[PDB]
């Protein structure tokens, strides 16, 4: 079965932020308009028996002091009065400012993704689903005691932690977002059981700054986690095929050597040619150019390993819905072996007018550095195998 995280309270909470507005409502409504919902298993978000149980779940990664500050920030934003100088200073010490400000539902919004990604991990653990999708999750930048790049709570780290601790176990994390997945990489830096891999753009002054050369060398983990953090920085302007050729062999070689028990894929839509970032030139095209996202999702799904698929970045809301709707249909096709015919025209639904003026499912777009990175990565995987006493071909 293929699971998808949703609910009425979950939808209201996922649509309550000022940065992502109603994006989640558009993604789920396009999936529903295309009659994909009957083919999917509804995975309800996790709920706790008490504030103590919730705090124990979140503090498996975040500090109590940061969680307290985030809850206080919500309370302060449900009042018209300005924050005191002392409260501004407290929030600044946790970076609860600038790109991560307060708003009336900041804590409920952030916790909602945690609730969804933990429930998604649980459904894989009990074998109820073979793959689970969470389009409200994928907040890769959040750190132990720091909000970062629109991420307040790291739902990915908490989901992976639940997976790695499930047997009385190895997880492969694949980060497809345009930005380097620093928060997840940092959390498992000292752990060989979680292997992280991020493909992204990296250039001077481009967020977050990491996932590139530090004689410059790549840092890749420490202690028992040495060689367990993998990075592929790419130049701006990369199309579907070149991005596909750069990642394909790395993905296949990580599966062969690591042999993960679970795969967690962060599927941020900010690499799309139509994203306001305008860095990469990836599409959502599915031939009967092939979308970079659709090529990598298909490859990962062909391994037959229980997989968690998450959202993330994606600033052109209708185009993010166009891609994630196609990811959802491909996942059904690949897991169930049931053809999902999707009409090239947008079906009529509540958000139809947002897909104008053409109303098409395809995004409206017309189209040896990698070799040295490939040789560096092949050597890192060999050192990872040598240190971890794994048998490789």
Ligand X SMILES: C[C@H]1Sc2ccc(C(=O)NO)cc2NC1=O
Binding site for ligand X (CB under 6 A): 99, 141, 149-150, 177, 179, 207, 268, 270, 312-313
Which of 62, 140, 141, 200 is catalytic? The answer is 141
Distances (CA, A) of 281 to 116, 284, 299, 313, 380: 30, 10, 20, 15, 28
Q: Which of 122, 198, 291, 331 binds K ion (CB under 5 A)?
A: 198
Helices (H), 259-291: none
- Site membership for Zn ion, residue 275 (CB under 5 A): no
How many whole angstroms separate alpha carbon 264 and alpha carbon 300?
A: 10
- Site membership for Zn ion, residue 221 (CB under 5 A): no
Q: What angle do CA 112, 330, 345 make, to 5 degrees?
A: 95
Q: Are 383 and 194 a contacting pair, CB within 8 Å?
A: no
Backbone angles phi, psi at 239, to 5 degrees: -90, 175
Q: Which does 62 bind (CB under 5 to 8 A by kind): K ion, Zn ion, ligand X, none?
A: none
Q: What is the DSSP letter of 83?
A: P
Place of tokens 């958000």: 351
* CB of residue 168 to Zn ion, shortest distance in Å: 36
Backbone angles phi, psi at 265, to 5 degrees: -110, 120
Cβ closest to K ion, residue 225 vs residue 318: 225
How many whole angstroms separate alpha carbon 115 and alpha carbon 153?
A: 11
Cβ closest to ligand X, residue 74 vs residue 320: 320
Q: Which of 29, 146, 155, 270 binds Zn ion (CB under 5 A)?
A: 270
Residues in 211-250 that interact with K ion by CB under 5 A: 225, 228
Cβ closest to ligand X, residue 207 vs residue 352: 207
Q: Which residue is nearest to ligand X (CB)?
A: 149
Q: Which residue is nearest to Zn ion (CB)?
A: 313
- Site membership for Zn ion, residue 175 (CB under 5 A): no
Token duo for residue 95 = 């970076």
Cβ closest to ligand X, residue 292 vs residue 312: 312
Q: Are 123 and 129 a contacting pair, CB within 8 Å?
A: yes
161 appears as a binding residue in the annotation: no
Name 272's Cβ contacts closer than 8 Å, sequence gap at least 6: 280, 282, 283, 284, 314, 316, 319, 320, 323, 363
Q: How would DSSP label each residue in 130-190?
A: SEEEETT---TT-BTTB-BTTBSS-HHHHHHHHHHTS----EEEEE-SSS--HHHHHHTTT
- Interface segment toward K ion; rule CB under 5 A; list 89-97, 197-205, 281-289, 292-300: 197-205
Token duo for residue 79 = 């009042």
Cβ closest to ligand X, residue 45 vs residue 313: 313
* CB of residue 20 to ligand X, shortest distance in Å: 10
Q: Are 278 and 320 a contacting pair, CB within 8 Å?
A: no
252 appears as a binding residue in the annotation: no
How many whole angstroms separate alpha carbon 26 and alpha carbon 254?
A: 34
177 appears as a binding residue in the annotation: yes
Residues in 171-190 that interact with K ion by CB under 5 A: 175, 177, 181, 188
- Interface segment toward Zn ion; rule CB under 5 A; list 7-15, 172-180, 361-369, 381-389: 172-180
Q: What angle do CA 289, 300, 111 make, to 5 degrees?
A: 105
Q: Which does 149 bind (CB under 5 to 8 A by kind): K ion, Zn ion, ligand X, none?
A: ligand X
* CB of residue 178 to Zn ion, shortest distance in Å: 5
Instruction: Indicate if 201 belongs to the active site.
Output: no
Q: Which of 313, 322, 324, 330 binds Zn ion (CB under 5 A)?
A: 313
Q: Which of 177, 182, 240, 334 binds Zn ion (CB under 5 A)?
A: 177
Cβ closest to ligand X, residue 26 vs residue 76: 26
Contacts with K ion by CB under 5 A lie at 175, 177, 181, 188, 191, 194, 198, 200, 225, 228
User: Which parts are annotated binding residues for Zn(2+)?
Assistant: 177, 179, 270
Catalytic positions are 141
């Amino acid at each position: 079965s293929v699971g998808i995280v949703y609910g009425d309270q979950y939808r209201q909470l996922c649509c309550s932020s000022p940065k992502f507005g109603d994006r989640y409502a558009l993604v789920m409504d396009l999936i529903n308009a295309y009659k994909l919902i009957p083919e999917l298993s509804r995975v309800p978000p996790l709920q706790w028996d008490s504030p103590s149980r919730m705090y124990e779940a979140v503090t498996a990664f975040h500090s109590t002091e940061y969680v307290d500050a985030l809850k206080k920030l919500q309370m302060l934003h449900c009042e018209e009065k300005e924050l005191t100088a002392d409260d501004e200073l407290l929030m600044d010490s946790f970076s609860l400012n600038y790109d991560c400000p307060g708003f009336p539902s900041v804590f409920d919004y952030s916790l909602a993704a945690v609730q969804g990604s933990l429930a998604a991990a649980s459904a894989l653990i009990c074998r109820h689903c073979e793959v689970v999708i969470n389009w409200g999750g994928g907040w890769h930048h959040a750190k132990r005691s720091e909000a970062s790049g629109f991420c307040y709570l790291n739902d990915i780290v908490l989901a992976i932690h639940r997976l790695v601790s499930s047997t009385p176990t190895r997880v492969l994390y694949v980060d497809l977002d345009l930005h380097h997945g620093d928060g997840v990489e940092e959390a498992f830096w000292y752990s060989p059981r979680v292997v992280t891999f991020s493909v992204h753009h990296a250039s001077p002054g481009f967020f977050p700054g990491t996932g590139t050369w530090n004689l410059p060398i790549f840092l890749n983990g420490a202690g028992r986690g040495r060689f367990s953090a993998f990075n592929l920085p790419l130049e701006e302007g990369i199309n579907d095929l070149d991005w596909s050729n750069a990642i394909g062999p790395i993905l296949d070689s990580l599966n062969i050597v690591i042999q993960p028990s679970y795969v967690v894929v962060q599927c941020g839509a900010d690499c799309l040619a139509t994203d306001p970032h305008r860095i990469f030139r990836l599409t959502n095209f599915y031939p009967n150019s092939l979308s970079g996202y659709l090529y990598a999702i298909k490859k990962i799904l062909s391994w037959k390993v229980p997989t968690l698929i998450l959202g993330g970045g994606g600033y052109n809301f209708p185009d993010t819905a166009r891609l994630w709707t196609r990811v959802t249909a491909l996942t059904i096709e690949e897991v169930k072996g049931k053809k999902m015919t999707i009409s090239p025209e947008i079906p009529e639904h509540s958000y139809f007018s947002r897909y104008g003026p053409d109303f098409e499912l395809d995004i409206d777009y017309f189209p040896d550095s990698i070799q040295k990175h490939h040789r560096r990565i092949l050597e890192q995987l060999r050192n990872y195998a040598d240190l971890n006493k794994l048998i490789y071909d």
